Design a protein around this ligand. Structure first.
Ligand SMILES: CCCCC/C=C/C/C=C\C/C=C/C/C=C/CCCC(=O)O[C@H](COC(=O)CCCCCCCCCCCCCCCCC)COP(=O)(O)O[C@H]1[C@H](O)[C@H](O)[C@@H](O)[C@H](O)[C@H]1O
Ligand SMILES: CCCCCC(=O)OC[C@H](COP(=O)(O)OC[C@H](N)C(=O)O)OC(=O)CCCCC
Ligand SMILES: [Fe+3]
Ligand SMILES: [Zn+2]
Lengths: 26, 249, 233, 214, 268, 122, 30
């Protein structure tokens, strides 16, 4: 719930889009 | 994006709509003869995938309203080019329906932007307390944003729906998955704007002056079209199917 | 009720259409006199059915603003600059009283503070200049000082004097014959017979003066002044 | 010593137009929002800005001849309130009389160069002198006076002629503060529907002119 | 000619129809709305064979009400909502002495204390907003703060100040140089010379400020329309198009205020 | 005594680009951009909102080297906004954001240098 | 004063009347 389900869920690690959308300036 | 941002807003409204209809007509009248070994179908396939992906991944990193609109335009161009990649009557029909719906949504959004441009709106955070000062303009802008996202009840869902149907008709399953993921990302960064208007409570508010009659009537008509298009969509489909067939006979 | 409000709103729609037609007719003839910025102030203003009921022998100054359910007794007077606004509740003004210049007698604007108490004014009650009466209730033959700020829930008993500049806090009763003054209002001294007699005579003096002011305000509007304003070069 | 005056024979003793509500001073024209209710007895002179949902009630004078006067969103200026602006304030901050959103100004309130932060309640007979700041989410008791340069800390109740600290506002009061402004806005909107865009008094003027020819 | 006459007749018919519609709509309203009438408010009004003697240069706001035996000196001004009721006894406003907004000056009944005297306001005095004067004898070069109440019998001497929100009790004399204030109206402090300079400068500034209000409140209907059109025409500017056309639009003199009312005298 | 506005008045020295030093006044608890706006050094119509996401370094300021230690360290968002609008993608190592500097009574006499204006209309 | 003086405004009124009458006839005749 708070661990594997969350980390592999939508915001534990799926928030890499912040580290992916911001790179579009290249 | 730089051209769209730097251009005057009334100018940006025209370049976002008019140069696309005519150019798409030219591309169709080139496909009627230039289908040489399905060469363009591959080029438009790659261009559409890349356009959807880049628009979706670039509009989430935008804080200004006009840059976000430009990247939305790029994403919708990719969604329309999905129809080009699948050469069939039901593909060209999906393309034309998407063009029509996108043009109407873009006119709606740019009328809303021009309404707020009298108070020099530049950032998404500027339209923070719009749900309190003008609680009907916020609703209209949220409707337009949801129509961009493709929420089922609104008119923006019909175009994406029928484009995905056309893509699956030719058997391009890879296009459907990319379209679905791009739709999820687009819906996220579109409801992000709706979050700002209604859910945030900024310390400093920006008060806008009321719009004039022309833009008010245009917004009212386009908002009634967007919400109530699913009830009576037959004429658009009929005229689009008639146009698609007439490209050859 | 709700049926009356619909007819009232339809009346506004039809009156607006008629006024627009009249303006269009004026524009065809070349006239533009409707653009004149005339004052829209009404000494007696109604809010739907709530309209002020003013006795015939009561002086109301042309600059005084009376709004809503306001009742004025015979011999009373509302002087220049007064604002008597009772809309959520009623404002009852007795007979022989005198709301003096630039005075405010109004009721609360919302139910958040609780219940909106109607403002009641007795008979032969002297309200001072620039006195704010906000939802209180004064008995007859009383005196309210200049600049007083009576709040709601306040009862001023018979023959009770509120000193000038005082601010009577909420839910305060001034006993008969006692003078309450200061901020906040506190007992200061007991009224004497001479002050009672003067209070009684002041009401009659102002009642007689209001008749003269009403006579001077009921004269026909001067036409020389109207012509002079018309031609300004 | 003079003790001598010269009456003017062209002075007007009765203006049939009455007092004009909007008084422009040169290029400064008061700006009133279409959603804002301004009573017909109100005088707006100079650069005065009234925003959406705001309301100005009977007898109020808003003279923005010296500096700017601004009334915020859903903030109300009640009966017979004089709002004035000075050239400069003692504190050194700009002296524009600025009223933010959800500010309730009680009747007989005299504001001069004061700045009122959002969600404040000003009591009746309150006097806010030059360069006085009322911090947000605070209530000023009725009949309270604060000298120039004084400040009301946020979240506190203040009152008295040399305004002093009374107590600290609870959560319920500081959250019901904007509800009072909303209720007063609703009442002002109720008053707003009693007036058509154009009055019909010009017909009376024409009848009066016809009674005297032209 | 004939077309003009026909259009005039059509306009008459349209006006008649519009007035009929207005009457019908008024009938449907139930005759509950009180109709707006011509303004009956008299700026200057006589009471008992007594007329105000307002001087030529005095600015009396249209919403003010100078009533009864009032004598007003040159250069002074009576502002919006101010009431000077001198029906019972005399009120004598001095030269340069301005009475500000919503202020009330009223004289006693000549017997409120047996030996009552008229309200004699001196020269160059300034009275704050919403102040209440009821039989004082304010001497020249004085300051009465906004919201101050002066009961009958008080005498504000020269170069003395009454603090805003004060209540000067009856038969109270404010000595020169003091700043008496508070609800009991007790001694606060001594006045500095900067305060005296401020008093004089405020009086002169209000004298200079009354002139634009006087020139604005006395305009005719024709001038008001012209000024409104000019104000609309010059509200927003476009320097680029003017430079492209080789013209320079300049604000007309009717929309220019004298430099003596600007914050620091800005010529440009 | 009583609560004075002067009890939270922050005296600052702001240098506009042409080297003139004028003393501005601010309030302790409000952003330094607000303090600069009072006199008119920074156009209020360019930075109407004191928020990080509604900013393109239109409130950029140059804090003194000795006056930068008594301030919160620059956050990631502040650096990201500063780099993009630099027109050269370089860091001045002494430039802060006006909307992200909150005045404090310990900042009495802070010397701040306002750079040249930049276009912001569209 | 039973004459409308502005010649240009009179022609606009005539043109508006003609436009309304023609539109009504157009909606009726076809
Ligand atoms: C109670 C039961 C009935 C209840 C129903 C009653 C119905 C009444 C009958 C007809 C209603 C007519 C409705 C038609 C209304 C049209 C819109 C009005 C147009 C109009 O502003 O007027 C003329 C314009 O001239 C035309 O450029 C275009 C104007 C051409 C149209 C005008 C022709 C009107 C003649 C109508 C026939 C009357 C026949 C008799 C009718 C009465 C029966 C006896 C006056 O110009 P103007 O420069 O002085 O001023 C205008 C005006 O101020 C605004 O439009 C603008 O602010 C300004 O820029 C300027 O344009
Ligand atoms: C039947 C009534 C016709 C009355 C015709 C009429 O009044 O035109 C004016 C109106 C409002 O336009 P104005 O800004 O000139 O207001 C002018 C305002 N009346 C004023 O006086 O200030 O035009 C319309 O929108 C209506 C378009 C459809 C017209 C059929
Ligand atoms: Fe910033
Ligand atoms: Zn009196």
């Amino acid at each position: 719930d708070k661990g594997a389900i969350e980390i592999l869920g939508p915001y534990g690690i799926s928030y890499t889009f912040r580290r992916l959308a911001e790179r579009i300036s290249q | 994006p730089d051209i769209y941002e730097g251009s005057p807003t009334p100018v940006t409204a025209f370049l976002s709509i008019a140069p696309k209809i005519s150019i798409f007509a030219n591309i169709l009248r080139v496909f009627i003869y230039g289908s040489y070994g399905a060469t363009l179908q591959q080029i438009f396939f790659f261009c559409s995938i890349a356009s959807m992906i880049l628009g979706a991944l670039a509009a989430m990193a935008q804080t200004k309203v006009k840059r976000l609109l430009a990247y939305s335009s790029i994403g919708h161009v990719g969604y329309i080019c999905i129809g080009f990649s699948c050469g069939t009557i039901e593909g060209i029909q999906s393309l034309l329906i998407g063009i029509f719906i996108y043009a109407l949504m873009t006119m709606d959004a740019f009328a809303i932007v021009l309404a707020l441009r009298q108070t020099r709106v530049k950032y998404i955070a500027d339209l923070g307390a719009l749900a309190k000062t003008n609680p009907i303009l916020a609703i209209t802008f949220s409707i337009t944003m949801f129509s961009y996202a493709g929420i089922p009840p609104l008119a923006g869902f019909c175009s994406k729906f029928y484009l995905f149907f056309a893509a699956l008709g030719c058997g391009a399953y890879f296009l459907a998955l990319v379209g679905v993921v791009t739709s999820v990302i687009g819906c996220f960064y579109y409801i992000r704007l709706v979050k700002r208007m209604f859910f945030d409570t900024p310390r400093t508010w920006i008060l806008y002056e009321p719009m004039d009659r022309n833009k008010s009537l245009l917004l009212a008509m386009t908002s009634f079209f967007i919400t109530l298009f699913l009830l009576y969509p037959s004429p658009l489909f009929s005229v689009t199917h008639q146009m698609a067939l007439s490209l050859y006979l | 009720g709700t049926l009356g409000r619909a007819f009232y709103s339809v009346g506004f729609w039809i009156r607006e259409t008629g006024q627009a037609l009249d303006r269009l007719g004026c524009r065809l003839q070349g006239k533009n006199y409707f653009r004149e910025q005339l004052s829209r102030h009404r000494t007696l203003m109604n809010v739907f059915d709530k309209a002020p009921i003013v006795d015939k022998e009561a002086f109301v100054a042309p600059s005084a603003s009376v709004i809503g359910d306001v009742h004025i007794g015979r011999g009373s007077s509302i002087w220049y600059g007064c604002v008597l606004r009772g809309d959520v509740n009623t404002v009852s003004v007795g007979s022989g009283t005198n709301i003096q210049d630039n005075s405010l007698v109004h009721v609360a604007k919302s139910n958040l503070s609780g219940k909106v108490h109607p403002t009641i004014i007795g008979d032969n009650v002297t309200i001072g200049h620039s006195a704010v009466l906000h939802g209180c209730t004064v008995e007859d033959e009383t005196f309210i000082g200049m600049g007083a700020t009576l709040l709601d829930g306040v009862v001023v008993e018979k023959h009770g004097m509120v000193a000038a500049g005082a601010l009577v806090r909420q839910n305060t009763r001034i006993p008969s014959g006692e003078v309450w003054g200061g901020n906040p209002a506190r007992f200061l001294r007991k009224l004497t017979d001479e002050e009672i007699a003067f209070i009684s005579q002041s009401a009659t003096n102002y009642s007689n003066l209001a008749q003269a002011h009403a006579a001077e305000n009921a004269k026909p509007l001067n036409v020389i002044e109207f012509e002079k304003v018309l031609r300004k070069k | 010593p003079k003790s001598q005056v010269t009456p003017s024979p062209d002075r007007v003793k009765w203006d049939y137009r009455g007092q004009r509500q909007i008084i422009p001073l040169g290029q400064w024209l008061p700006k009133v929002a279409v959603d804002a209710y301004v009573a017909p007895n109100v005088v707006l002179a100079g650069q005065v800005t009234v925003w959406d949902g705001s309301s100005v009630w009977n007898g109020a004078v808003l003279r923005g001849d010296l500096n700017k006067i601004t009334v915020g969103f859903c903030s109300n200026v009640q009966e017979r309130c004089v709002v004035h602006a000075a050239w400069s304030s003692p504190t050194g901050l700009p002296a524009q009389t600025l009223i933010d959103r959800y500010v309730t100004v009680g009747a007989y309130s005299l504001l001069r160069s004061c700045t009122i932060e959002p969600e404040c309640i000003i009591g009746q007979h309150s006097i806010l002198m030059e360069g006085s700041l009322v911090e947000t989410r605070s209530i000023l008791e009725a009949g309270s006076v604060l000298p120039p340069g004084r400040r009301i800390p946020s979240g506190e109740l203040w009152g008295g002629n040399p305004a002093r600290f009374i107590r600290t506002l609870t959560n319920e009061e500081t959250l019901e503060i904007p509800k009072l402004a909303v209720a007063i806005n609703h009442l002002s909107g109720d008053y707003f529907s009693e007036f058509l865009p154009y009055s019909t008094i010009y017909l009376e003027v024409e009848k009066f002119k016809k009674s005297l020819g032209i | 000619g004939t077309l003009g006459r026909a259009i005039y007749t059509v306009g008459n018919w349209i006006r008649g129809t519009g007035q009929a519609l207005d009457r019908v709509g008024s009938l449907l309203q139930g005759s509950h709305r009180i109709e707006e009438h011509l303004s009956r408010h008299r700026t200057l009004m006589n009471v008992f064979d007594k007329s105000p003697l307002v001087d030529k240069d005095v600015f009396v706001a249209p919403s003010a009400s100078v009533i009864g035996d009032v004598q007003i000196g040159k250069g002074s001004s009576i502002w919006y909502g101010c009431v000077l009721r001198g029906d019972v006894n005399n009120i004598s406003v001095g030269s340069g002495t301005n009475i500000q907004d919503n202020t009330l000056v009223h004289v006693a009944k000549t017997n409120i204390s047996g030996k009552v005297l008229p309200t004699l306001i001196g020269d160059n005095v300034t009275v704050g907003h919403s102040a209440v004067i009821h039989g004082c004898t304010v001497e020249d070069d004085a300051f009465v703060g906004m919201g101050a109440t002066l009961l009958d019998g008080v005498v504000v001497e020269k170069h003395a100040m009454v603090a805003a929100g004060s209540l000067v009790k009856q038969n109270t004399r404010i000595p020169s140089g003091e700043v008496w204030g508070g609800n009991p109206a007790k001694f606060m402090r001594k006045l500095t010379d900067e305060e005296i300079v401020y008093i004089s400068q405020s009086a002169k500034n209000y004298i200079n400020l009354a002139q634009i209000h006087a020139s604005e409140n006395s305009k005719s209907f024709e001038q008001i329309e012209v000024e409104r059109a000019l104000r609309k025409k010059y509200a927003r500017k476009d320097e680029d198009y003017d430079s492209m056309l080789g013209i320079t639009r300049e604000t007309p003199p009717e929309l220019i205020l004298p430099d003596n009312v600007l914050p620091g005298g800005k010529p440009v | 005594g009583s609560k004075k506005v002067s009890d939270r008045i922050v005296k600052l020295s702001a240098i506009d680009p042409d080297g003139y030093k004028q003393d501005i006044i601010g309030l302790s608890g409000q952003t330094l951009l607000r303090a600069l706006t009072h006199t008119g050094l920074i156009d209020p119509a360019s930075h109407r909102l004191d928020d990080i996401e509604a900013c393109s370094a239109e409130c950029e300021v140059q804090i003194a080297e000795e006056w930068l230690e008594k301030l919160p360290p620059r956050t990631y968002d502040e650096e990201y906004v500063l780099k993009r609008s630099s027109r050269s993608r370089i860091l001045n190592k002494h430039s802060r954001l006006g909307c992200q500097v909150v005045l404090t009574q310990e900042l009495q006499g802070m010397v701040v240098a306002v750079p040249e204006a930049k276009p912001w209309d569209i | 004063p039973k004459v409308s003086e502005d010649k240009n405004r009179n022609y606009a009124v005539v043109a508006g009347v003609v436009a309304i009458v023609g539109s009504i006839g157009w909606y009726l005749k076809a």
